[PDB]
Amino acid sequence: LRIDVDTNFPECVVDAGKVTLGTQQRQEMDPRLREKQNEIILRAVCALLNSGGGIIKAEIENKGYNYERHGVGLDVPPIFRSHLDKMQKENHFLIFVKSWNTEAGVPLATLCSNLYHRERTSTDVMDSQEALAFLKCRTQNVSAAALFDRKRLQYLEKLNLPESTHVEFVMFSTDVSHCVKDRLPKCVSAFANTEGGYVFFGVHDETCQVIGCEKEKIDLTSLRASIDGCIKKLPVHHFCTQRPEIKYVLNFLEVHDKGALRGYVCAIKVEKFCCAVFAKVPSSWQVKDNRVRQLPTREWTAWMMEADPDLSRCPEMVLQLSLSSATPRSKPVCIHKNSECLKEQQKRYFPVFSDRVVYTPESLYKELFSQHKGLRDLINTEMRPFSQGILIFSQSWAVDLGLQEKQGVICDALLISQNNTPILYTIFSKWDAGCKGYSMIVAYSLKQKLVNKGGYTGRLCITPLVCVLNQIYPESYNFMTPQHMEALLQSLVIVLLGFKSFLSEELGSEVLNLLTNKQYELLSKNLRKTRELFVHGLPGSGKTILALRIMEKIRNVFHCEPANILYICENQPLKKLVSFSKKNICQPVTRKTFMKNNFEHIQHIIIDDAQNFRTEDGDWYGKAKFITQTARDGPGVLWIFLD
Ligand SMILES: [Zn+2]
């Protein structure tokens, strides 16, 4: 497996190698290879069901395959069929995967939980719903023993002990060691998860007759060694404090025949473990570092129980995107009770009514049309066929996500239109070799933010097109309702207004929040048009929540470095919260070290709460305006979040 963005689709094109398709062709080939390819494809599907959906290519080995005649041939878990959409190109099978929709409670998509469990007679793996319930419940035999201590066991002595919740008979295979190592994780996991029961290797399970193995190949020493190894190597988890170890006991019940010993019956007694025990790491995957990565048992078990954090501590908050109706990688979104919900923000920033085609930014489309001549003609030409939708403009859409603005890009237009794929229009003053690259990367990052961060469950593709002002998805991906583009815009409001809140990242895992109208206004303002601004006093964290994003914008637009964005803030909690952040935004230095040091290379400066600047320290405004105006490249930006 790998991850390829080189494909025309602006998505996560997992290259799953070459498969051999066709049901009959599946039946008439190597079953080992069939299972290998099926497992690889399901690996890729489980990877894309978490990461945010994408594509799976496959170089078909079958010459003359046809998706209408020969079928597919893939054996797929039943829950992994509501998401896959298959397709064929002349020599490439494609499988388009949407998100996971956190359907039926389970947060992430799992192939198999590998949390075995023993029912009345059989050891079955807990499905994802059972495993989630089982973790949620652990977080919040005298007769078989008498048999266990028995010394003499004669051949074919029919045991009075029947298979039950606490016993299990497993006959010996050809290789006793290989078979016991293959079966021990299973039964040990089963017993530890359940009330805890014994297991006897070497005795038939239905007739319950002592058989054992021949002594010529078995060695009790190496057997016990391998058993304790493969029993302590089991990936376990622990919701408790002591963190004990798997407390088992092993015994070799003797085996006699006509008064002559001929083998043993490996009797293993596993006690009820206080925490979950796996047979190996869960078979769940994701796409990380642009490759496939198996979620670690600790992260798997802390993700399956990543319930929406209890907002009972702060009864003033209100939840708006629960993780029970979102994607795997989404986070909840709480808003103050008085601040507007997600629905009002959607209907205010991106209205939807089918009588015409409107523009989300009236002032951005207007100023762009009053400045550039011909932009109005190009937009009215491209926007002519579509009758219902909304065209949204942004001085450069790559910046509103977090990417890096390019040179020679007039503006970016996204059109949300029902009954057709949403279309991204990127308008260039001049054609070059970066048109396609920039458009595809902006569209790909936009879809990723809409799915992962925004939490869009249904199918979503953003079609990128470039126009110099001077592929094909299946029918499923084409919108079909006016009640799903409403979901797309309720997710876009989150993508363009969501920030990782600081108030509640102590209240749980992590909880996003929504900027007000004034903060998004002051953020959307063009920097290359306004390199100097004095902001009215912002109540509460106004300036901080805004500055932490204005600095990312400053780094992206001006191609500046984090080391050239000075952040002059006084309060020490602000200093630690901004500096010790993992993203390395700026250099928070107080007013004292501001005027007690020389900044030779600082280009952009953002000041916080100039109301506390003492005059005896020095006339800060002159020095600041000097160091910005005389910056290395051009007049630097100067934002003073005074009150
Ligand atoms: Zn424990």
Numbering used by the authors: 3 to 142, 169 to 498, 512 to 684
Show me the paper's own sentences about this structure.
The Schlafen family belongs to the interferon-stimulated genes and its members are involved in cell cycle regulation, T cell quiescence, inhibition of viral replication, DNA-repair and tRNA processing. Here, we present the cryo-EM structure of full-length human Schlafen 5 (SLFN5) and the high-resolution crystal structure of the highly conserved N-terminal core domain. SLFN5 binds tRNA as well as single- and double-stranded DNA, suggesting a potential role in transcriptional regulation. The N-terminal Slfn core domain (residues 1–336) is followed by a linker domain (residues 337–552) and a C-terminal helicase/ ATPase domain (residues 553–891).
To gain insights into the structural organization of subgroup III Schlafen proteins, we employed single particle cryo electron microscopy (cryo-EM). The full-length SLFN5 protein was vitrified in the absence of nucleotides. A 3.5 Å cryo-EM density was calculated, giving insights into the overall domain arrangement. A majority of the protein could be resolved (residues 3–684) with exception of the C-terminal ATPase lobe (residues 685–891), which is likely due to its flexibility. The data was acquired in the absence of nucleotides, suggesting that the missing density of the second ATPase lobe could be due to relative flexibility between the lobes. The N-lobe of the Slfn core forms a second large interface with the linker domain, including several hydrophobic (Ile57, Met89, Phe98, Val479, Tyr514, Pro515, Tyr518) and ionic interactions (Asp87 to Arg487). In addition, the loop connecting the Slfn core to the linker domain (residues 335–366) holds the two domains together. The globular linker domain exhibits a mixed α/β topology and connects the Slfn core and the ATPase domain. The highly conserved SWAVDL motif (residues 424–429) seals the hydrophobic core of the linker domain and interacts with the N-terminal lobe of the helicase. The N-terminal helicase lobe is anchored to the linker domain by an α-helix (residues 561–568).
